[PDB]
Scaffold this active site. Structure first.
Site, PDB file in Angstrom:
ATOM      1  N   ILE A  50       4.060  43.507  62.674  1.00 15.14           N
ATOM      2  CA  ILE A  50       4.458  43.696  61.286  1.00 15.14           C
ATOM      3  C   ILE A  50       5.508  42.670  60.870  1.00 15.14           C
ATOM      4  O   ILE A  50       6.361  42.946  60.026  1.00 15.14           O
ATOM      5  CB  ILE A  50       5.019  45.112  61.050  1.00 15.14           C
ATOM      6  N   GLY A  51       5.439  41.486  61.469  1.00 13.94           N
ATOM      7  CA  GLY A  51       6.389  40.436  61.149  1.00 13.94           C
ATOM      8  C   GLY A  51       7.079  39.883  62.381  1.00 13.94           C
ATOM      9  O   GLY A  51       7.817  40.597  63.060  1.00 13.94           O
ATOM     10  N   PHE A  55      12.848  37.359  67.852  1.00 14.54           N
ATOM     11  CA  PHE A  55      13.394  38.510  68.561  1.00 14.54           C
ATOM     12  C   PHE A  55      12.654  38.741  69.875  1.00 14.54           C
ATOM     13  O   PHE A  55      13.209  38.542  70.955  1.00 14.54           O
ATOM     14  CB  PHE A  55      13.310  39.763  67.688  1.00 14.54           C
ATOM     15  N   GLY A  56      11.396  39.162  69.773  1.00 16.06           N
ATOM     16  CA  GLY A  56      10.600  39.411  70.960  1.00 16.06           C
ATOM     17  C   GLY A  56       9.134  39.623  70.643  1.00 16.06           C
ATOM     18  O   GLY A  56       8.362  38.665  70.570  1.00 16.06           O
ATOM     19  N   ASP A 184      27.771  44.553  61.366  1.00  9.85           N
ATOM     20  CA  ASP A 184      27.290  43.352  60.687  1.00  9.85           C
ATOM     21  C   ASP A 184      26.334  43.712  59.554  1.00  9.85           C
ATOM     22  O   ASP A 184      25.115  43.668  59.720  1.00  9.85           O
ATOM     23  CB  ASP A 184      26.596  42.414  61.677  1.00  9.85           C
TER      24      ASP A 184
END
Length: 403
Positions: A50-51, A55-56, A184
């Site tokens: 889904i995108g 990241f991984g 953050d």
């Protein structure tokens, strides 16, 4: 005797359709159809991503061993080719703070009826060719606020920011009680629920601040290493230099976030390619709420909602208490000025008419690299030789006189 499900016969699968399909895009790590195991306690079926980014391996997971997953999986799983750090931070914080058992009880205790903590179900692992792949399943999660930033016209709105700001404030109050700060708050850390598009959550926690250090007696440090929180994405000037524990920084990020989205980028967080000015502007703006609010927002007595909030954050030091309850009122009270209301909307709809988004965006991407030759092994001869002796020939002459 027993039977699957409550009892819903098949009868038919399609009334005006006929495609099904299967071959779309194979894979080596996590393809569409393969099943994944959790901590030796579950077995979810991996569907489609889904995108992707940096990241991984994000993929949809379902609690069924049927053929083809498709859109029948209200869960997402992030996988990584062997690792021990990033995921470890999210996993730990997830099971500790994102525990449905703790959240449900906590949210019920304060009746938050929302909270800013994702829903953790479990984790899994998969060994391939000797490599151990660690992944984790999440509630849903869809797109990030970054995507909404452009949908607002390269600049958020007073209603959105104020509304979203409050939703985030409640989050900082939770993580604080869990010994977690500096989450953050940004457009790349805030995501909206997929299965339920309306609310947003703040990711990244374990990789920020777990409430003070682990083994340190001295409060002061003055060394940007013990923390190293992010790089410069609205991070506190002190938190970046590991100076004193981080607590007010959570409020600073939100304070500047409004001006960044409402004004659309500022002379500090424009590209982050030149921290030189980012640091100077940060220290100046931090003490120039009136100068920045006037330079970023109109000068027709329009502002005020933020100013009050920024003020509290500017004085937030000689009050001890985080003053979270007050800050929330600042951004919550202003809602009345814009004819807004605090019910349960994020205004992050960004066109919710249709039910089938795709658009032309399917190109051949990269993955790995494999050459034909490699300088790892081929021939290792011997150059040097160790041998302490003075005999070899079967003759041995005799000359001169050793005296």
């Amino acid at each position: 005797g027993s039977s699957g499900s409550s009892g819903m016969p098949r009868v038919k699968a399609a009334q005006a359709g006929r495609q099904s399909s299967a071959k779309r895009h194979l894979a080596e790590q996590f393809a569409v159809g393969e099943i994944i195991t959790d901590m030796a306690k579950k077995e979810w079926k991996v569907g489609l991503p889904i995108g992707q980014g940096g990241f991984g391996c994000i993929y949809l997971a379902d609690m069924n061993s049927s053929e083809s997953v498709g859109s029948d999986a209200p869960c997402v799983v992030k996988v990584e080719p062997s690792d021990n750090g990033p995921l470890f931070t999210e996993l730990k914080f997830y099971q500790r703070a994102a525990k449905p058992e703790q959240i449900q009880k906590w949210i019920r205790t304060r009746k938050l009826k929302y909270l800013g903590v994702p829903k953790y179900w479990g984790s899994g692992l998969h060994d391939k060719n000797g490599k151990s792949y660690r992944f984790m399943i999440m509630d849903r999660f869809g797109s990030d606020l970054q995507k909404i930033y452009e949908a607002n016209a390269k600049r958020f709105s007073r209603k959105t920011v104020l509304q979203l700001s409050l939703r985030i404030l409640d989050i900082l109050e939770y993580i604080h009680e869990h010994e977690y700060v500096h989450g953050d708050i940004k457009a790349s850390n805030l995501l909206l629920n997929y299965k339920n598009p309306d609310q947003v959550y703040l990711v990244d926690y374990g990789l920020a601040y777990r409430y003070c250090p682990e083994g340190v007696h001295k409060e002061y440090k003055e060394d940007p290493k013990r923390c190293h929180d992010g790089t410069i994405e609205f991070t506190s000037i002190d938190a970046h230099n590991g100076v004193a524990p981080s607590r007010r920084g959570d409020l600073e990020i939100l304070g500047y976030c409004m001006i960044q989205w409402l004004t659309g980028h500022l002379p500090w967080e424009d590209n982050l390619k030149d921290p030189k000015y980012v640091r100077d502007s940060k220290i100046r703006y931090r003490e120039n709420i009136a100068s920045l609010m006037d330079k970023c927002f109109p000068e027709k007595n329009k502002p005020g909602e933020i100013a009050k909030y920024m003020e509290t954050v500017k004085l937030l030091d000689y009050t001890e208490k985080p003053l979270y309850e007050n800050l929330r009122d600042i951004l919550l009270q202003g809602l009345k000025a814009i004819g807004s209301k605090d019910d349960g909307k994020l205004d992050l709809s960004v066109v919710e008419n249709g039910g089938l988004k795709a658009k032309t965006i399917t190109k051949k991407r990269k993955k790995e690299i494999e050459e034909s030759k490699e300088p790892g092994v081929e021939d290792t001869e011997w150059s040097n030789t160790q041998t302490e002796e003075a005999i070899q020939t079967r003759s041995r002459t005799r000359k001169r006189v050793q005296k």
